[PDB]
Structures are given as structure tokens and as C-alpha cells.
Amino acid sequence: KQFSKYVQEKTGQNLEQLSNEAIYVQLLHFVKEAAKDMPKNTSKRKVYYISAEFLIGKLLSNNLINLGLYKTVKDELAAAGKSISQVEDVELEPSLGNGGLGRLASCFIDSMATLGINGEGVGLNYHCGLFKQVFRDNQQEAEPNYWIEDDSWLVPTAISYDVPFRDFTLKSKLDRIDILGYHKDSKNYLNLFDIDGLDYGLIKDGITFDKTEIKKNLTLFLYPDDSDKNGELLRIYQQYFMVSNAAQLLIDEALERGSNLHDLADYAYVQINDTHPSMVIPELIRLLNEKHGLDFYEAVDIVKNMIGYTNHTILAEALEKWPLEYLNEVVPHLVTIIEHLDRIVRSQYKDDAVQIIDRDDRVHMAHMDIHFSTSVNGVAALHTDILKNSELKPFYDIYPEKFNNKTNGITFRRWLEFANQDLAAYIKELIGEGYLEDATELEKLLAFADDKTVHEQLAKIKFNNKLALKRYLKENKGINLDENSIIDTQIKRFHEYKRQQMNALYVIYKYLEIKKGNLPKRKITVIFGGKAAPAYTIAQDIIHLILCLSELINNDPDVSPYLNVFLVENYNVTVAEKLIPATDISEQISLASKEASGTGNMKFMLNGALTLGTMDGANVEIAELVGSDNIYIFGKDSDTIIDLYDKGTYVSKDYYTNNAVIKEAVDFIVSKDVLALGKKERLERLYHELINKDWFMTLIDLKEYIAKKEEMLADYEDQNVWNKKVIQNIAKAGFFSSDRTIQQYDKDIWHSL
Questions:
Q1: Which domain range does residue 644 map to?
Q2: Is-catalytic flag, 663?
Q3: Which of the residues 498, 510, 544, 732 is marked catalytic?
Q4: Helix (H, G, I), strand (E, B) or coil at 111
Q5: CA terminus-to-terminus distance, the chain
Q6: Annotated catalytic, 40?
Q7: Same domain, 28 and 113
Q8: Residue 364 — φ and ψ, nearest 5°?
Q9: Same domain assignment for residues 344 and 424
Q10: Catalytic: which of 493, 578, 724, 740?
Q11: Residue 204 sits in the same domain as residue 344
Q12: Which of 335, 440, 450, 467 is in the most buried spot, having the most CB atoms within 10 Å?
């Protein structure tokens, strides 16, 4: 009863008589006090992980888990008549990330701490995230995503750096977050840089704000609006700010540890999460050459031997580019250096395709990263091979030695030990506690593949997790979930090629089948989650549809008993932690050539969910690890899509007219029922888009998708066969541990340990 005695100390009261809010605060302090006295990791070569996003999630629970204190606390609260979940709901989720890029960063830094690697992340302390998602009149609106309280996980420091821009120099401030390792005595920091004199008053209506007020807006928003020059410039301010703080920091930290700057490579290595921190290269060079009096060409040799680049993009065309003119507007002094690097490269390599600056004066930040780094890694085996063989071949041809693969991973603490405690205990029950050190020892679960006693338990755990979710959704999302239903979940950002609209077309089908009187064996609950870019009109039309549908569906006594549709508001980490452990069907149905990886896929696999999806991305490795029978793959090959794009012979109108399933679903979008619920403009627009354009081929796989889903649903009805495949999935999920992924980064690239 360590925490109970603590509250008595600091409060003079018992748990029984405190509020959930006051208890959270007390836990906050309890934990920050435990972490404060923990030493750092001491590996001589420190790794620096720079990322423009860290989708880190709530920290209370994970911190407790990593301290080993989570169960005793959960017990003491219940014995006081208090639900931990309600205490957890007090914390606001850090708005420091958006998509898979950020989450990957979080999972990676987590594994760093758990493996005792002296490796810290560096990013920005965004006071509002991408944006807070709010539904009004069946449409997505945006609002600031504030999160920072006075009492938070942010540990203030006294460190400040000057960041020089053309029109001014900015003073930075640094707040750190303790990144704890699983049952470890030493900790890491997450370094988040920021400025004072931030003005929230700029924000006016929605997320609108004056993009030119740099001193007041710098760290307000992640990925601020980009539709105009001024917006673009702000992105540059951001990127350089993050980068300059990072480099200044690592140099200081190197020096403290007795480094002369000639041997910096022995003290520091840098991994840049995509193209956002590319400007760290010429920045480091600047610091060494001008601030520390090192010969320019020596500075270059030193920096290019301690830089690591990670490319998440597939196509080289999509890589980040900057007009020289814009850069001179913001970081002209750096530009000079970047032009020097262009000279070095352009003199040595005759291939015009590898040049940093191109004919139109655009600066290819990726091209810079490749020339002056020791490693360029891909995220997945096929993805890396695409880079080496086509997209980045010009660079492969001269830098064969740099290109390697590093399959993405997820942290098993957050996505198993916490997300699904029930399941976590059961695993240990069956195959022991070894899988904590080695996630591949989940293959011991195979021996129980045919055991009926287990199939019964997994279904029970599944059912309990649905109850855990039902509590949550009711409590925080105003949603009434039916626990006695098949739960089908698609949680991704809204883009045409993610094809949420395909899943919505299936809903319209299933709705029409029920109205015909052809009823499901079991009730189905389709749940969506994710944001759309405010400027992306079609994506917002799609979101609008699905909201019209869930209103139509869930308010029809004839259909309600058989079909529920939900779009959970403001999808994020803590919502995923609830949805995923309660999910039967994992929707991973993006177009065939558009996904490189997909950690979401990897989470569902771990939480006992069967996957329904295309042969692409993480699906590929999954389908390999399990059997073809233990997954429901559909749609066209990657090759077939690419080629069809190449021939330009796809006409979505033909699929519409020729296939009744489709013809009927699409026509329903503008039917009388739906028009009444929603806006004519949106629904009519989306409706003509699918017929006349449909650039990401929603209609191509629809007919087979619907079919494959119905098959999968019917296979649910046998719970011995179903959970046999579930055991197949979970027994092979050990492959996607982020601890394995980091061990590989460290072994091949960083050499920190």
C-alpha cells in the first residue's frame, strides 16, 4: 500500500474521500517523484531521434506499468471504491503527434528506454496538435487541441538556445518528459523545445490564425495550413527551429562528456524520422565551422558520419522539396551552406538525378540526407526494395552500402500489457513470462491452437474488452455500443486511398440486405475513427456520409437490432487503446500500392483480431507469418494497380453500371432518406466523384470486398475455428515488437550499446 500511504502524507486524507481529479494529481506527483531520482543511461555514444511529431498518448498508466506499480494502485483504488479508468480520464492526451510517423517515434523511444539505450527523442512542444475533431451537423469541424495543464508531465529545464533567422533570432525554452523503461532503474528524456510569449489570441474562429506572427505562433499547431506561401514559410521556421535546438543540444552534451568536437561521432549519432529534420545536417556543419572554428570540409566529414536517415515515403516524387527563394527568405545563412554542399556533390557525381538543387532551383532535402548520412533505411522489406530498385535507384547505384531495411514495430507495453491486461495475464498463464524479454516466444501459443478450453477464454477476454470499451464510449463519446455484436473497426486518417468510403458502401449494401429481409446471423457494429485534412473536401464528404449513415442506421427499429455504425469523435491514442483490444475485424483495406507499412495492422494482430485487407503494406508480412486461412485477403495485386495507373484505362463508371451491388450502393448516397439527413451539396458531389472520377479506385475491389466480408462474418459463427486463427495471429505477433526493431537499428546503424 505504497501509494495510499503517500496520499496520506501529502494530503492528510484517505483515498476513499478524495475526488478522481485530486487523486490524478497525486498520482502525477507520485510518479514524477519516482522518475526524478532515476539516473540516465550512460552509453558513450548518445543517439538523438528527431521527429516533427510524437504521438505519445496519455502517460499515467504506461508510466505505472513501467514502474511495476499499476496493479497495486488499481487494487488500492477499487478497495477505496474508485475506478482507475475514471482517474485515467482526468489526464489530457498530449497533443504532440498526428499519424503513424509520430506513433512510431513514441514506440521507438519507449523501446529505447526499456532496452537501456542512451537514446533520446527531440521534437516540438505543440500546444495544440493537428486539431481537435468535433462533429456538428454531420460534418467535421476543427478546434484547437489544447492539452497542457500547469501540473503536467512536462519537466521544466533552464536550457535555452538562440535560433537565427533572417529577420530575427529566437530564444528557445526546453521541457522534458520522462520516458520510462519496463522495470528499469534508469530513464530517458524526451526533449521538447518551445518558446515563451506564445499568444493563443491569434486563433480566432476554429484553427484559423495569422501564419506570419512567427514569434507568437511558432509552436501553436502541428502541420499548420499549407495552402499559401505564408503557411509554407512557417513550416520552415518550425523545421529549422527544431533542428537548431537539437544540434546545439547534442554538441553541448558532447562537450560536457569530455568531447573535443573532432571526435563528435564517438559521442553522438542522429536519426531523422523523415525529411522534416533534414536541415540538421547543414546546421551541424554551421555550428562546427563557424561557432567552434573547425575546417568546413572537416566539419562535413564529421557530420556525415553520425547522421541516419529514415524514409517512410514510397515514391521519390513525393519527397520534400523547398524553393531556394523561400529558404533564403527564412534561413539565408543556412542556404549558403546548402549551396556549398550542392557544390561538393555536383562536382563528384555526374548523375543529374541525385543533385540536391535542381534546374528549377528546388532543394531536395531528401537528396541531401542521402549524400551526407551513413544509413538510409526503409520501413518494410518490400518498401526498402522499392527504394533500391526503382524510386531511389540513382542513389542506390552510388551508395549501395547505405541502404538497409528496418521493419516497423510496436511497443508491447502499451499495446498489450496495458491495452489488454486480461490478455496479458492469460498469455503468462499459458507460456510463462519469457515473452517480455523475447516477444518471439509468443510462438509457444501455437501448442494451444486446437485447445477448446483456450478458444473459450479468448472469446471471453474479447467480450470483457468489449465491455471495457462500452463503458468508455458511453462515458466519453456519448455512444451506446452493443457488446453482443461483431465489432468491425477501421481506424485510420481519412484519405480516398484508405478507402473508408468503400467500407461505407458496404454498410449501404448490408443496410439494403436487411431492408430486403435478409438478416445477419449475428449483429454487426462497424466503427470508424480518424481525422481528415480540412482542405480535403472529398474526405470530408466521406466523413459526412458515414455520419448520415450512422444516424439513419442506428435510428431505424427495423435495422437497429442487426446493424450499428459509429464514427468515434476525435480519434487518437487513448481511443485506439480501447477500440483495438475489443475488435473482431481489423479493416486494412487501403489501395494495393499505397501502403508501405501500418502499425495499426500490427496492433490488431496482437490483440486477437483477424485481418480483412489488401495484399500490401504490413498485411504482406502478416499473411506470411500466419496462414492464408488465418487472414482474409482480397482485392487486386500491387502490380495490377500500378500497371492500371500506368495504362490509365480505369473507368469507375463501368464498375458502377455493370455491377448491381455497386450500382445500388452508390445510388443510395443521393437517395431521399440520406438527402434528408445531410447536405445536398456534399452528398451530390461525392456521388458524382465516385462515378466520374474515383481516382483511388473505390469501385474496383468493392464487389469482392463485400463478398469477402460476408464470408468472414459467417466464419465468425463457429467460435472454435475462428479463435483457432486468432491464436495463429497472436502467436506470430512477436515479430512486430518495437524492441526487436530498435535492436536492429542499434546493431546495424547506431552502435550505441
A1: 410-737
A2: no
A3: 498
A4: helix
A5: 37
A6: no
A7: yes
A8: -90, 95
A9: no
A10: 493
A11: yes
A12: 335
